[PDB]
Amino acid sequence: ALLQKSSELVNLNARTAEYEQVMNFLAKAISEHRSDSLYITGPPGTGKTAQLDMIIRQKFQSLESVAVTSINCISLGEPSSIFQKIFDSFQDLNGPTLQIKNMQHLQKFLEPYHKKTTFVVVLDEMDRLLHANTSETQSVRTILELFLLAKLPTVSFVLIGMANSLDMKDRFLSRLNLDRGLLPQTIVFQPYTAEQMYEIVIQKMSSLPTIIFQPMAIKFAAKKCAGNTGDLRKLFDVLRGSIEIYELEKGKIGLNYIAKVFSKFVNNNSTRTRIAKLNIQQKLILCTIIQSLKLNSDATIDESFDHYIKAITKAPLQRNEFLEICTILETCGLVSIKKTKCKGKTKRFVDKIDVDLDMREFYDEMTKISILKPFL
Template sequence: MMLNGRKRPFLAFESDGELGCGNSENMTPDAKRFSGLTTPPASPEKKQIKKPLGIVSSNLTNINDEPYTIESDLKPKRLMFGSDPIFSKTKSLLQQSSVSNLEQTWLATRKSEYDEIMHFFHNSISDRESADNSLYITGPPGTGKTAQLDLILRDKFHEIILDPKNKKVTKHDPELLNTSYFETQSDIFQSIAVAKVNCIALSKPECIFQKLLLEIVNGKYKQQHHKACDSVKNLKSFCRSKPNTHFIFILDEMDKLIKQTTVLSSATKIILDLFLLAKEPGINVTIIGIANSIDLKDRVLNRLNLQKELLPKVIHFHPYNSEQMFEIVRSKLSIFPACFEIFQPMAIKFATTKCSGSTGDLRRLFDLLRSSVQLLELESLKGNSDKTRGRKVTITHVAKAVSKYMNSATTKTRIAPLNIQQKIILCSLVHRERFDLNKCLCTVEEAYDYYVKLLKRTDVMKPLSKAEFFESCYSLQSSGVALIEFTKKKLLPSGAAKTIKSTVIGTELQEEISKIDLLKRLL
């Protein structure tokens, strides 16, 4: 095998010893592997590369204990969202679900409401003959009603008891779910079963009895109770069969039971049956209703002419004022002090003033502040990072967020969520402004007097008390249909007072109100 008198080079799979020429001991390692092949392998041979035992640290060594250096393109790259992580932290702290203090059981500025609820629980659970066995918690949206009750259930109702001094702790009934222990006295614990139902999720009000039972019955026993509990009578029988357990039934958004049916008497009977269930002698049941409607008790229960001891205890969650809102924001952001420092204090106070003038809804406040942070973050991304590094959220940022959240909704969408009493108050404001030739400033007190006179003349509905009227006015401002301001002008008798005016278009309001027969006479 000669080419031009020269011996051609051997291939990787050939050697001098092939075809019987030479000794296999002298063969190269590649020739040994490919011995017997007449043609090269179809695929090129991949060379083995020694790799380290893991590429998780730049300090690793290979199998020969030689230093191993990760190439720069193999190192993980850090992804940056936004120009500064402080923005993400701040927006996270301003989420509604974030908790500012895990050590205390009451929400910021809600210590008095917490004390009232705890006093109610102690009376209801420890004393079976107590009159405090039904509770109605009311207040505008975003005032902490459900959140405060959830905190109490989390911290004061114990799933297990660690090393109790009183060894005679009642064991939970194996047929029940959502059980816990409540300490009625020192080292005296009562077995509790809690059923919490959001009434918005009910297809029809009549399902409430079955839904409550299914929340506390173990899966093994649900089949036998699923169809049996279709009335308050069946629910009552089940509770009587568990004398060692105290039942707590919580109805969140209870006023939705009335809105889900056109027959008011049917919904009224269901609510009445639930509250009277707690008043039954020899039964361990506590009923708690939560609703935004401040007049539900008057519309549904007081009209039934019940005895005073049969009516539920009422706890009002009043709207947050500006100072309370500022304290809540400060306590939330104080977890990371740098998050509080990116705000100008006057910017937070401006936002709290805007929101407290409505319902005092914290959810609206958190939305405004998060939107303000986003505006600052966008500015930092667009501009020079060195110039924007020391900037803070200012009143200008908050004002832009306010115009976005509060002025973008149409009159129709702003009026739709209002309850009947709020719509009546709005109609009285518009009615007065329409017939006020001098366009005088109207104080909140004057608006209340006009509202009472208008209702007495039209006989549409019984007027609210002054405190309830003021609370509803703040709700109107939160919804963007009214504006309350502290005005200092010589035209006012006292020189300074809170004035109120509507912020809706009269023709659009007339169109929406005309759909409700009850309110047609007000405009």
């Protein structure tokens, strides 16, 4: 069971290149003061939830008195239910009525009756809440509203932000950016040198290895993942698949998966294009759609079939053969036929045609067929 004990997908443990950087943004967690004005904002999969498990797992165990429970910004949707879920501290009788109006009714609850104690909540996936109200109206309004740090008594009620992928970071406004609270610190957490990260996950071991993964294949895996944004959860589902395709024989085999899932999504632009088409009637029609693009952008299948009897007019053929042979070009993954608005003059639905790949390699695909050269 040494192959099953190689679990790389969900595990107990930036621990890769920024260990001093994560261990120097946890300052005032024992002095009962305000620590850091940081905003964790990075690519989706770098390890923000990973560091923010350990940063509280240091301060969970025998509790100076700290009571802290983590929740998420999931069942909110609208800016309506932010404050009720964090109110399971002393399970009070109040909470529904007095609290959800105003900041001074939560400033009423910032002073601690039961000693200084501690209660710092970490609202998780906080960019998911602020993506409503369509300009700023009650979500970006709430983000410029709940980052006020105005009165600072002896009260431990800080809240670090858990922002998601860089979808709407670079969109700002002067209310969000002018000296109120926890703004001016944001860090990209991209795990470069993830080879050493995998070495830490395997050396933190409970199942002794004999033949380790080859670091040439490990560095090839770390090369062929971090070009897009550098997702680590994406790379964690690659070596697991490599040892899963190793078990299908009952670095030499941890490569054909990426050389398998890159080629599978890619397939062949022109080599398999005609190969799969093998049929000429499944070949020249793609040229008919190519000629039905530089005259009209509302390429109806009729327009793909009025182009058909403006090319072959030199055993009959009905429209059903054309629209079912187009399903082959649908099945392979080139063409899109669905109902759209059909702007035109009247606005009722009809079929469309669209193509995806750029006309560079397909123009080299016709260099072997002598009948698809005059149609270009």
